Amino acid sequence: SMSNNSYLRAKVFETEHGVCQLCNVNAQELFLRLRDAPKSQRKNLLYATWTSKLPLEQLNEMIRNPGEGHFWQVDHIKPVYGGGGQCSLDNLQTLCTVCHKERTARQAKERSQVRRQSL
Ligand SMILES: [Zn+2]
């Protein structure tokens, strides 16, 4: 279970410091830069880098008030087909939000494929 999310984020951060383990962006460093930029500079910063691939809805929230969870998430290293898996620390990793969303979107298709193959 990932429900104990604060705890898990902080434990993974002790080792990974908000660096995506798939694409190696330093998502925490971008968070801090955005947080401390004036709102009026945030849009151009976000569209100049890997965050440009996030949903417009999320990017609008990030311009108003960025939070750490907009930039990186903890997720499984070995997920089950369709999502889930063991939530022990040795099966967890930092993903930037763009990688996390690709993974989530893939797992929703996988859940589709599972439902299909059993109808
Ligand atoms: Zn990434």
Numbering used by the authors: 1 to 119
Question: Which statements did the authors publish about this structure?
Answer:
To gain structural insight into the ZRANB3 HNH domain, we solved the crystal structure of the C-terminal region of the ZRANB3 (residues 948-1067) by experimental phasing. The HNH structure contains two HNH molecules in the asymmetric unit that are structurally similar, with an RMSD of 0.76 Å over 117 equivalent Cα atoms. Each HNH molecule contains one two-stranded anti-parallel β-sheet (β1–β2) surrounded by eight helices (α1–α8). The structure adopts a ββα fold, typically found in the HNH protein family. It also contains a non-catalytic zinc-finger coordinated with four cysteine residues, conserved in a subset of HNH proteins containing the C-x-x-C dyad14. Overlays of the ZRANB3 HNH structure with its closest structural homologues showed that this ZRANB3-specific HNH insert adopts a well-structured α-helical domain. Analysis of the electrostatic surface potential of the HNH domain revealed a predominantly electropositive face, with a continuous positively charged region encompassing helices α1 and α8, as well as helices α2 and α3 in the ZRANB3-specific helical domain. Although the structure of the ZRANB3 HNH domain does not reveal the presence of a divalent cation in the putative active site, residues Asp1020, His1021 and His1045 assume equivalent positions to the catalytically important residues within the ββα-metal fold of T4 endonuclease VII. By analogy with the T4 endonuclease VII structure, we hypothesized the involvement of Asp1020 and His1045 in metal coordination, and the role of His1021 as a general base in nucleophilic attack. Although the mutations did not have a dramatic effect on DNA-dependent ATP hydrolysis, some of them either substantially reduced (N1036A), or completely abrogated (D1020A, H1021A and H1045A) ZRANB3 endonuclease activity. This is consistent with the proposed catalytic roles of Asp1020, His1021 and His1045 in the nucleolytic cleavage of DNA substrate.
Cellular responses to replication-associated DNA damage are centred around Proliferating Cell Nuclear Antigen (PCNA), a DNA clamp that acts as a processivity factor for eukaryotic DNA polymerases. Structurally, ZRANB3 belongs to the Sucrose Non-Fermenting 2 (SNF2) family of ATPases and contains several identifiable domains and motifs, which provide specificity for a number of defined substrates. These include the amino-terminal SNF2 ATPase core, two PCNA binding motifs (the PIP box and the APIM motif), a specific type of zinc-finger (Npl4 Zinc-Finger, NZF) and the HNH nuclease domain (named after the three most conserved residues). We have previously identified ZRANB3 as a structure-specific endonuclease that plays a role in the replication stress response. We further defined PCNA as a key regulator of ZRANB3 function, which recruits ZRANB3 to the sites of stalled DNA replication and stimulates its endonuclease activity.
